[PDB]
Design a protein around this ligand. Structure first.
Ligand SMILES: Cc1cc2nc3c(=O)[nH]c(=O)nc-3n(C[C@H](O)[C@H](O)[C@H](O)COP(=O)(O)O)c2cc1C
Ligand SMILES: Cc1cc2nc3c(=O)[nH]c(=O)nc-3n(C[C@H](O)[C@H](O)[C@H](O)COP(=O)(O)O)c2cc1C
Lengths: 295, 301
């Protein structure tokens, strides 16, 4: 099967973002990884897949301990730093655990592991580690879905019911916070099928909407790692929507049209339901939304 | 180390929801699993961990193929059905057959038809590695599982709150749309509510139960599972923790919150209302009333 088409199919499985750290001596490594997952509770075992050609596996193989840093939603810069080969720990504060495990700050969780055993896994090494100490902080996590960073949309869905007061799960869910998250649910249920029908994934749409206006700068605006940007710009170039002459990325006439239609789709739901309101009422709704954001 | 405290710490790593299916004959199994993850591209290898006490591993060990069904956000009922041991999980459940008679569900985000590659020991679980021979890429909005509760994906990249120009706040000039303003409003609200809820020592599973049980008592776990969007296993886990804190009473008929539990549910309500009441205080009562009615129009209630 095609490796690229398979990697893009794996993007449907949303995961968190972890950073695997280890230190021997003074040799230190930091690898951003999303192949992490749990295995067993007794004993406490976790695994993750590291590339066989990664220049960091030698230090993971030499060190007796490695750490799993569950990144929070406010650690996108920390994810991109430990995502490209480099002194990755330059100007990066961290603490040391058992086995000199580099532990970062403001993380959602951390798992200090002893190296349990390594297993063959195709073109990767499956590193199994025994958790000897963990940290449960509970901060809002960072997501990685379809090659783009996202966040978790909280609150359970509402019963779409019998009574007007029975729509909410409880009587206390009639709050502004719950109404905002459920408005995004109803909006996402209307926009996502329309974007998918046009053959655009999340990585493709974010680049069309950004490049239509005006690699590190682009990485910080679309919230996508460099590896996913290079992958998506290639796909957009195959569809005749982008030209990568070597200097920068520019959308074609065909690319600018697709970016504007994605704007029409993201506005079709609000324009369809707010048609009964006046122009001043719709303008007030945006001004009150900006007051919630802070702009 | 404590297994329970360790399992709760594992909830910080948000994952999607998959259902592992296999069929031999007519012997059929379906296990909801979030331990799934990718391994290798060449060859295409994926793994997941199945419990050693699972009554379905024997059929997974016998069958030559098993499937990974990536569930979508509208498949919470399908996740809970295949989340409890039953003799006929596929009753009144439509599905198709792939290679090796792999049961494939409909309306999923993605699917991975795999041949049984190798099984590896993994503590109290079996690590099943499978080689992907066929996949389906649909791209639907996925179902999330974080801190023992079902959730959805909050899209769109964050906006630049520290820029010079007013039009430079958005990543592009086309991001000034109502969809983006709604998602970024939830970001600003979550950044204000989430740190305050954590300061009270309540996770997602605890907060959803406090806000639901405060209104009415919950008799059957099947109904409570459908309202808080949490599997039965997490409800029994969280109601115990709320009971340790003196916030819940399980008399045997129905879950009931204590007066201390009712207090914690009200304080979570004030925190969820503090941000809007603080920024919308300049608006009139009719303007704030219109904002809720226009939000309900977006939802459909
Ligand atoms: C979101 C994300 C997930 C990643 N997951 C893995 C992974 O599971 N295994 C791996 O070897 N590299 C993964 N990488 C790439 C690592 O950052 C990798 O260490 C990087 O290419 C550095 O290469 P080096 O270790 O050879 O120096 C991931 C990168 C990103 C952005
Ligand atoms: C969100 C979620 C994720 C789960 N992940 C796994 C898993 O990765 N491995 C596993 O063996 N069971 C997992 N389970 C338990 C399954 O629901 C499993 O089907 C259940 O224990 C019954 O299995 P049985 O039919 O083999 O007895 C998970 C349950 C839920 C709710």
């Amino acid at each position: 099967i095609d490796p690229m088409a398979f990697r893009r199919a794996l993007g449907n499985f949303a995961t968190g973002v972890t950073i695997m750290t280890a230190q021997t001596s003074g040799e230190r490594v930091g690898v951003t990884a999303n192949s992490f997952n749990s295995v067993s509770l007794d004993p406490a075992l976790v695994l993750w897949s590291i590339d066989k050609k990664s220049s960091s596996y030698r230090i993971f193989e030499e060190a007796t301990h490695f750490g799993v840093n569950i990144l929070s939603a406010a650690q996108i810069e920390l994810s991109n730093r430990f995502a490209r080969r480099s002194d990755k720990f330059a100007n990066i504060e961290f603490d040391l655990g058992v086995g000199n495990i580099p532990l970062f700050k403001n993380c959602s969780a951390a798992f200090e592991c002893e190296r349990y055993n390594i297993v063959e896994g195709g073109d990767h090494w499956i590193i199994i580690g025994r958790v000897v100490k963990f940290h449960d902080h509970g901060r809002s996590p960072l997501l990685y879905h379809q090659g783009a960073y996202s966040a978790v949309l909280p609150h359970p869905s509402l019963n779409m019911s019998e009574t007007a007061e029975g729509v909410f799960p409880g009587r206390l869910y009639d709050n502004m916070y719950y109404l905002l998250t459920q408005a995004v649910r109803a909006y996402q249920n209307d926009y996502q099928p329309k974007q998918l029908a046009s053959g655009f994934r999340t990585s493709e749409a974010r680049l069309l909407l950004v490049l239509e206006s005006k690699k590190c700068d682009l990485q910080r605006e679309v919230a996508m790692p460099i590896r996913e940007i290079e992958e998506a710009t290639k796909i957009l170039s195959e569809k005749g929507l982008l030209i990568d002459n070597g200097q920068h990325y520019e959308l074609t006439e065909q690319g600018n049209a697709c970016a504007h239609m994605l704007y029409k789709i993201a506005e079709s739901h609000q324009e369809e339901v707010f048609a009964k309101y006046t122009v001043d009422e719709r303008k007030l709704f945006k001004n009150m939304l900006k007051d919630l954001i802070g702009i």
